[PDB]
């Protein structure tokens, strides 16, 4: 190890840990928390950004002065990535759009730029890489999300043989676009879950669990080339989350089955909005898709993190969607959803 990268301190904010992160697209949900965990023991992140610096303003108070640098970077440009990864012990990739964009497509955001950053990182001389994919990333899956994730996954793995791969099942948290997305369904009448959502199972993962799992993977010397997958402690049927999170939000639960083709029609209609679409056809069939149960891939328990229950850390997020009539209601009133055991 280099003389300037020897870790020191008690793992505090101004302590130095010798890890030099270069998290990509951290101006998002999970990128926020990993940087927050990255600044816990004082690891100088680079966090290249493309949006306005004001939207990146909130990341400053997660590290000592000069520990969180900000570098302008463009995905399409080649030298843009290289200019932020020359002096990085590790490189973390989190770039991903959950909807179609005119200037960036699912393919462009999931095979083009992760391969490009991986090949320059190996060329630059990085020591690690953490490319995240989806646990549901299947090459022949109906969703454009999962197939794009899969083709990029083999691309980065081929480009970087030692690139540790993370595939969390589904991410639930403060602004997950998953729990709040279900809560947002109240404004459009009843819940438009196809066939009452009785045929779909998911296993959500807490942010603190996955975000920690990143830097335990970073500090673990045996994670090079592994393909860790992060899943929650319990799975639940799709109809098993909907009423539970409605109940924990105390909102009027109105399930309403409807045909899938019309569900696709609604998804396309919401896509026509020039601004950020509320829903797209990709997430339309991604919701009803059921996660696998593959145990061969190592999990977060291998690194030494226990997967927190969905019902345990839920009051923090779903409390916002409650009204004044239930803002002070505890989680004793609600009951844990009917877990489907493996």
């Amino acid at each position: 190890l280099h003389h300037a990268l020897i870790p020191h301190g008690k793992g505090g904010r101004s302590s130095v840990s010798g890890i030099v992160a270069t998290v990509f697209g951290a101006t998002g949900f999970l990128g926020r928390y990993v940087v927050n965990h990255l600044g816990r023991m004082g690891s100088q992140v680079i966090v290249p950004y493309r949006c306005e610096p004001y939207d990146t303003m909130h990341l400053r108070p997660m590290g000592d002065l000069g520990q969180i640098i900000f570098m302008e970077w463009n995905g399409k440009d080649k030298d843009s990535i290289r200019k932020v990864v020359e002096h990085s012990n590790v490189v973390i990739n989190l770039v991903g759009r959950e909807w179609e964009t005119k200037n960036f497509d699912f393919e462009d955001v999931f095979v083009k730029i992760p391969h490009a950053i991986a090949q320059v990182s190996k060329e630059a001389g990085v020591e690690k890489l953490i490319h995240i994919s989806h646990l549901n990333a299947d090459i022949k899956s109906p969703s454009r999300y999962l197939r794009s994730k899969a083709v990029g996954e083999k691309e980065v793995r081929a480009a970087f043989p030692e690139a540790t791969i993370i595939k969390p099942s589904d991410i639930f948290g403060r602004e997950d676009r998953f729990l709040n997305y279900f809560a947002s369904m109240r404004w459009f009448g009843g819940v438009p879950l196809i066939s009452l959502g009785k045929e779909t199972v998911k296993q959500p993962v807490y942010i603190v669990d996955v975000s920690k799992g990143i830097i335990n993977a970073i500090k673990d010397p045996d994670a090079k080339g592994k393909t860790f997958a992060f899943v929650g402690p319990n799975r639940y049927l799709l109809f098993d989350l909907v009423q539970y999170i409605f109940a924990v939000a105390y909102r009027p639960f109105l399930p309403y089955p409807l045909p899938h083709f019309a569900y696709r029609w609604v998804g396309r209609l919401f896509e026509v909005s020039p601004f950020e679409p509320w829903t797209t056809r990709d997430k339309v069939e991604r919701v009803h898709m059921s996660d696998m149960t593959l145990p061969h891939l190592p999990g977060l328990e291998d690194l030494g993190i226990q997967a927190t229950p969905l019902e345990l850390k839920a009051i923090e997020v779903l409390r916002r969607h409650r009204t004044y009539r239930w803002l002070t209601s505890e989680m004793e009133d609600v009951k844990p959803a009917k877990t489907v055991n493996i």
Binding site: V20, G66, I69, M71, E72, K83, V84, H87, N89
Partner: peptide, 11 residues
């Protein structure tokens, strides 16, 4: 050569 601290002079 490496000296990760150099990144502060970038940009």
């Amino acid at each position: 050569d490496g000296d990760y601290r150099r990144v502060r002079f970038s940009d």
